[PDB]
Ligand binder design. Structure first.
Ligand code: BGC
Ligand code: BGC
Ligand code: GLC
Ligand code: FBW
Ligand code: ZN
Length: 257
């Protein structure tokens, strides 16, 4: 099964998911000097005040915080997006050390981790139909650097001991994802893909320029999770990131002059 190890990691994925070598794969390096300000991008609207979180799950690759997406609540609109995209889950990618962990890079810089808030285009009715469409998904990506603690992350940190191994879940109601955002919504955007199998080319990426700061202790607790299930040999859940992929025939646009 796919994973991040030497024998099943990103360099192997193409054998079962040939789109891994496709024309709009993610992540990419964001060259900040070649990214061009796009005056046509509409204002971005992150509207999370009515979000309904439900559960946190260790899926053997990362942990997902899942949201009720049965009606318009937490939604992402504007920017490059045509229509309304509903929040379904967020998760992170992170490293074994603070010097790596992000999927996107900024002028080749790797951050300690990267948060992905995943949304699907409501015109397609359900996530499964959305991932059959070129404009089915929008992922809001946020870099994490290590410094001061992020208060809005601590509830996540503090529940991880209850979902240590693959297949474990816990109730995670009444969590406010607004506490994970930076101050500024300046962003870069480009068309890409899921960064894990099945690597589907359905995503409008919106990557915020301003990182959030998290404490060393917060990210260290991410690294205590396990890729394996209960009773199996312990494999620490670290380095669950895909490296940057070829930009090919794409341009990265900036929301800011
Ligand atoms: O409890 C987390 C969040 O859930 C939302 O549904 C509420 O409207 C917010 O006020 C609250 O902060
Ligand atoms: O032909 C000129 C156009 O080239 C495109 O590649 C750029 O995205 C546009 O910003 C530019 O106006
Ligand atoms: O908001 C997410 C979670 O935070 C804390 O773990 C609370 O104890 C729990 O009740 C809540 O579900
Ligand atoms: N890492 S990611 O591209 O955000 C992603 C991968 C797979 C499924 C999904 F909903 C989101
Ligand atoms: Zn992701």
């Amino acid at each position: 099964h796919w994973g991040y190890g030497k024998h099943n990691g990103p360099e192997h994925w193409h054998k079962d998911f040939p789109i891994a070598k496709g024309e709009r794969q993610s992540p990419v390096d964001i060259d900040t000097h070649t990214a061009k300000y796009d005056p046509s991008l509409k204002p971005l609207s992150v509207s999370y005040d009515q979000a309904t979180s439900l559960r946190i799950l260790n899926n053997g690759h990362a942990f997902n915080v899942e949201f009720d997406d049965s009606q318009d609540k937490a939604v992402l609109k504007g920017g490059p997006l045509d229509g309304t995209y509903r929040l379904i889950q967020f998760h992170f990618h992170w490293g074994s050390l603070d010097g790596q962990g992000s999927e996107h890079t900024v002028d080749k810089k790797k951050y300690a981790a990267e948060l992905h808030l995943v949304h699907w285009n409501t015109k397609y009715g359900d996530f499964g139909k959305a991932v059959q469409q070129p404009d089915g998904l929008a992922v809001l990506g946020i870099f994490l650097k290590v410094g001061s603690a992020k208060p809005g992350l601590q509830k996540v940190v503090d529940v991880l001991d209850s979902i240590k191994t693959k297949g474990k879940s816990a109730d995670f109601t009444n969590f406010d994802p607004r506490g994970l955002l930076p101050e500024s919504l300046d962003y870069w955007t480009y068309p890409g893909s899921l960064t894990t199998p099945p690597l589907l080319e359905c995503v409008t990426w919106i990557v915020l320029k301003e990182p959030i700061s998290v404490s060393s202790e917060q990210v260290l607790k991410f690294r205590k999770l396990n890729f394996n299930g209960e009773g199996e040999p312990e494999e620490l859940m670290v380095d669950n990131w895909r490296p940057a992929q070829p930009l090919k025939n794409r341009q990265i646009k900036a929301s800011f002059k």
